[PDB]
Design a protein around this ligand. Structure first.
Ligand SMILES: N=C(N)c1ccc(/C=N/OCC(=O)O)cc1
Ligand SMILES: [Ca+2]
Length: 223
C-alpha cells in the first residue's frame, strides 16, 4: 500500500496473508473455512495466516492453517486478468473471534464515489521497494467506469473496477494482490492489477466481486 496508514493491530480481522515460505499475497476470510483471493495469486503449498499484524513476528493472535484446496475461477484469463478470483479452502475451520472474523459478500454492487478500505502488506513505495511489517490501510473511492476505461483503454472488462486517485500518490501495490477492497462492510473488490503503483492517471484495478457471488456460493456448497 502506497500513501496509506498503519491500520492498527487486528482492526481488519478478515485480512489474511498467504504464505509459501514467505508472504506473497493477501486474501479475505469469508467464513470459517474459505478465503477469497486473486487467481493470479495461485500456487501450490499455500498456508493461510489469520490474525496477523506484524507478518514477521508471532504476536499471539495468529492462526496458521494450511490450504486443502484452491479453486481458480473457471474463466480466469491470466493474460487479461479477466475473472481474477480464486477460492482457498482451509484444512480446518478457523476459530472466529474479535481478531479473526469473516467479511460479508455483497448482495449488490458498490457505487461510484463510495469510499472503500484497501489493505495489505505490499510495497509502500511508488518507485523503489520497501515492504512493511505491519498491516497497511488505504481509504480510496470507486472511480466511474468511464474514467476507469479512459485510464486503461481496451483493458477494462465488466468484471473490473477502478478505485483510487488519478493524481497519484495513493494506491495498492505489489504484495497487496489478492487482498480486500471493502465498501460499506461488504467485500466488493480484490487487489488485481494496475500500471505500476500510485502513478498519475493509473488507478488500481480490482476484481468486481459482486459478479461472482453465485459462483462463490455454489462452489462452497460443493467443496
Ligand atoms: N493497484 C495497483 N497499482 C497494483 C496492484 C496490484 C498489482 C499486482 N502485482 O502483482 C505482483 C504481486 O503482487 O506480487 C499491480 C498494481
Ligand atoms: Ca504475526
Amino acid at each position: 500500500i502506497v500513501g496509506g496508514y498503519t491500520c492498527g493491530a487486528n482492526t481488519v480481522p478478515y485480512q489474511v496473508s498467504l504464505n509459501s515460505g514467505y508472504h506473497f499475497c493477501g486474501g479475505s476470510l469469508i467464513n470459517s473455512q474459505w478465503v477469497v483471493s486473486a487467481a493470479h495469486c495461485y500456487k501450490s503449498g499455500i498456508q493461510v495466516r489469520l490474525g496477523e499484524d506484524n507478518i514477521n513476528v508471532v504476536e499471539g493472535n495468529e492462526q496458521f492453517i494450511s490450504a486443502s484446496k484452491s479453486i481458480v475461477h473457471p474463466s480466469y484469463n491470466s493474460n487479461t486478468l479477466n475473472n481474477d478470483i480464486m477460492l482457498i479452502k482451509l484444512k480446518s475451520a478457523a476459530s472466529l473471534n474479535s481478531r479473526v472474523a469473516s467479511i460479508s459478500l455483497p448482495t449488490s454492487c458498490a457505487s461510484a464515489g463510495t469510499q472503500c478500505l484497501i489493505s495489505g502488506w505490499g510495497n509502500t513505495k511508488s518507485s523503489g521497494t520497501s515492504y512493511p511489517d505491519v498491516l497497511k490501510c488505504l481509504k480510496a473511492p470507486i472511480l466511474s467506469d468511464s474514467s476507469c476505461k479512459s485510464a486503461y483503454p481496451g483493458q477494462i472488462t465488466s468484471n473490473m473496477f477502478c478505485a483510487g486517485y488519478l493524481e497519484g500518490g495513493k494506491d495498492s501495490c505489489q504484495g497487496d494482490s489478492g487482498g480486500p477492497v471493502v465498501c460499506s462492510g461488504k467485500l466488493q473488490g480484490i487487489v488485481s492489477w494496475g500500471s505500476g503503483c500510485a502513478q498519475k492517471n493509473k488507478p488500481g484495478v480490482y476484481t468486481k466481486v459482486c459478479n461472482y457471488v453465485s459462483w462463490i456460493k455454489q462452489t462452497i456448497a460443493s467443496n
